[PDB]
Amino acid sequence: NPLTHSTPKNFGIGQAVQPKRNLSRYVKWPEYVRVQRQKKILSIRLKVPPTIAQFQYTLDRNTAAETFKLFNKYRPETAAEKKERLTKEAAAVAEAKSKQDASPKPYAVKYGLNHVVALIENKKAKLVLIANDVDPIELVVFLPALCKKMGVPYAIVKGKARLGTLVNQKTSAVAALTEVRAEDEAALAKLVSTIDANFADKYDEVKKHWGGGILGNKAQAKMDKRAKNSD
Amino acid sequence: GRVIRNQRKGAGSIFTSHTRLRQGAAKLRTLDYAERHGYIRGIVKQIVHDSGRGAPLAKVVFRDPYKYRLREEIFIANEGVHTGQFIYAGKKASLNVGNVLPLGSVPEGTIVSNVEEKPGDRGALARASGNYVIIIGHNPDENKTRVRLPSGAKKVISSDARGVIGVIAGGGRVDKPLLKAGRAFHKYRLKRNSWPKTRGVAMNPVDHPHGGGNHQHIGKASTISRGAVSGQKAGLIAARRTGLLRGSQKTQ
Amino acid sequence: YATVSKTHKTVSRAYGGSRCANCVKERIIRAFLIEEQKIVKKVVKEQTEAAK
Amino acid sequence: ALKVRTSATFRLPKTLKLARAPKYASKAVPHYNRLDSYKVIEQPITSETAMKKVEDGNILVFQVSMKANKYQIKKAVKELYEVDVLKVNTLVRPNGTKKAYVRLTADYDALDIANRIGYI
C-alpha cells in the first residue's frame, strides 16, 4: 500500500537479466539417458516387420485386471508353505504309505519359458500371457505363432514385471495356467472369449501389417503444413 | 635422398606459430537468441594491436542476457569504428558501419567484413587488413545470398550468415616497401619460422628436386602435377598457365 | 595494502578507489540526463501513439 | 508431473557415501611410538668447541635423530632433563648426522646440567 511500488520488468531482448525459466526440454542428459530415449525413437522410425509389430498390442486395463484377478487365485506355494508341506509329506509318507501322497494335487499358474513352451506344444495350456516388453525380443517373437499353430489362446499382456508378482519374483516373461479349479472354469471361457477376439483370431490380419513410420514431431508438422497451406 | 623442407613443416615442431603476445582469437559473438531475433548493444572499450596481425582488434563488451555479468568479445576493428561507439548486433540491427547483421538483412551492394561461412561459425571471410566482401544479390530459395569475395570468386552462403558492416581496418599495409631484411625479419618473428628462404636450386640433390648442380637450374619442367607425391611437390603446382600476363580484373 | 588502514585505500565519495571525481561527476550527469530523457522518450511516443 | 529444472546442466546426483566399517582390521598390533625421546636425542656432542658453547653460551649440543624436527627436540630435551628451552637451532652435520644447538632459559645453567648428565 502506497509505500510499496509497482516496478515491472522488461524481460524482452536487450534488457533486464532474463529470469529463471524451465529448461527441462534442453538439459544435456547423461549419455545413458539419450541412448535409451533414442533407441525408442530409432525403432519408431524404420518400418518394423509385422512379427514385431505383433506386440505394442498390449491389453486394455479392464480385461487385464480381469485376467490378473483370476491369475492371482493360483499363486504358487510360498517358501513357508512348501516348508511345512515337506515336513508334512516326508515326516509321514516316508513313515507310512502313499508315495508322498499326503497332500492335495496342487493348482499353480505355471511359469518359466522352457516350461511354458513345451506346455504349448503338448497342448496342455488353456490360456497364456506373454509380456510385450521382453528383450531380447527373440525370446518370445514366435510365441504368438506357436499358440495360433497349436490352437492355444494367447494374449500379449503389458508387464513382464507384472507377471513377476504373479509368481513372486522380479520378472517372469510368460505365465500360463493349465488345470484350474472347477468353480473358476466359468471366467476362463469368458476371458478367452474376449481375448481370442483381440489376438489369436486377428493374428492373420496383424501378420500382414508392418509398423513404424512417424516422422517425429517437428518434421510431421513440416509435412502437415506442406499439405495444409500448400493444398 | 633427404626429407625435403616443405615436408618438415607438417610435424609442427620448429615450424608452429608464435602466439605468446596474441590477444584472443578474433570471433563474432556466439549466435544467441538476441542476435537471432532482435539485436543487442555493446560498446567498444578499446581498439588494440594484435601481434602478427596488422589490422587491429576491437574489444567490444556486451551484457549477458542470462546472468548479471559483463561479457567481452574480441572483434577485428573495422575502420571508422572508435572507442565508445555502440555496436548493435542482430537481425533487427541497423545498417551502420561497425554493426553486425545476417547477410539476408542487408540490401544488394552492402560491403561487409568478417562474414561467416556457415551461420554461427563466428567468422571466416575477409579478415585481413583492408578487406571486405560485397553483397551482389539474394535468393529466397532457402535463405541464400550471393557474395563476391576478396580473392574474386563469388560464393553463395546462407542469409543467416552474419557479416559485419564495413571494411577491416589496416589500410594499405602492403603499400610500404619493406626495405631492409631486418623489417622482414621482425615481421615473421611474430608469426612463424618461414623466413629467410633458401632456393631449392641452391641446395644439393638430397635436399630438393632442384638441388642438383654444376650449373644452377631446375633441369625439368618446374610445373608439377597435382597428383604428384608429397616429396615431389615443389614449384608451381597444378599450374594452369605460367609466365607474365598483366591481366587487369578477375572472374565476374 | 592488507597491512594498511582503509583511509589509505579510499577517498570519501562514490567509487572511493575505483573511479576519479571527474569520472564520477560525468558518471552522474550522464545518468541523470538519460533517465530524464527516458521519460521524455516514452511520453513523446505516447503522444504520437494517441495520434493514430 | 514433470519437475522444473532451471539449468540445462545435469550433475552427478549426490549419493550417500558410506563409511568404512571393516571386519578384520589392517594391522594386528599398532606400532609403538617410533621416534620417542630416547630415540630423538641420541648423544651429547662434546667437541672442545661445543664445550665452549656450554661454558659460555648456555647451549646444550646434542646429536639428534635425523628423522626429528625442532619441535620434537625441544620436547625431548625438556622431558629427559627437566629443563626449559628458548629456541632450538639445527644443522645437518656433513657426516650425515643431525646436530642440535639448544640454548636453555636463564633459570637453568647448561654447564651444571652438563656435568649433571655426566660429561664436561
Added chain:
RNA sequence: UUGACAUUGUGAAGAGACGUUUCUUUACUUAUUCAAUGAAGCGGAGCUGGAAUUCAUUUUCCACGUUCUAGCAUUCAAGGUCCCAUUCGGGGCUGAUCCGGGUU
C-alpha cells in the same frame, strides 16, 4: 586417383529392363558425416489487436517490450491475488498463454 561390393534405409517424376522390378535428374531422417553451445528459448497453436473479403464467415493477411549520450540493470521480482490466524517468517497462482520433451 578411378570403378565395384559391403556400411545402405524409406517417397516419388521420367527414360527404360519383361502392377512387381533394375537404370538418371530428387523429396524424406533415423544410419553415417560437420559445427556450436555452461545443450535457452526450437517446432506447432493461441491472448491482444489494425486492415481485408463477403454482397457477410472466418477465407486470410499484418503487427505484438531495446538506437541522440563511453551511466544503471544481480538477492526465487516489485505489483496483484490466494492460503498458515499469520508474532516473523514462509509458500502457492499470476507477473512471464498453451502444447510436443527433437539442445540447436
Added chain:
RNA sequence: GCUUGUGACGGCCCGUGAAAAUCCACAGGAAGGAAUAGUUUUCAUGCCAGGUCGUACUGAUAACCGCAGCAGGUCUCCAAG
C-alpha cells in the same frame, strides 16, 4: 664530473614489446544491530606460534670441462688518482 637509480618528455616499428598465484578497492545491500545500554578487533595497546631441506670452500694460468696443478673453454655484480 663517474657509476647507478629515478622522473617528466621525445624518436622508432607491416616489431607496439609474458602469464599466473597473490593483495586491495569500489558497486551491491543481504543481514545484524542501542538507551540502562550494545555496535564495532581495516584505530592504539596487549598474548602465543612460526616446521622441513640447502648454508663450509674454490669458481679458475691449480678446487669446473678439456686423460693433468694443461698458454684452450666456461654465465654475472662491485670499480679510486
Added chain:
RNA sequence: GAUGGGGAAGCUCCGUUUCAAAGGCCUGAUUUUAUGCAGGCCACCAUCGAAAGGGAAUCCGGUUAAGAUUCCGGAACCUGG
C-alpha cells in the same frame, strides 16, 4: 603429462576439456548432537615445469682456528592463531 575416452597384435599411440552423471564452499536447522540435514549461488577446471621471471616480512654493531643478513647484543617487521 595422469583421467571418461578413441587408436594399436602389443610394448603403447592419440586427446587435456578433450562427444564424461567429473565438485566444495558459506551456513542455518537441530540445541537427540558440533551435526545428519535444510536454504543455496559458484565452477567446460588433474598435476609437473623458473635457486636469473612473479613473490608476505631484518637491520646495525660485536664475535670464530674455520659459521654467520643464520650465533651474541640491541633494535624491528610479516604471517597465522
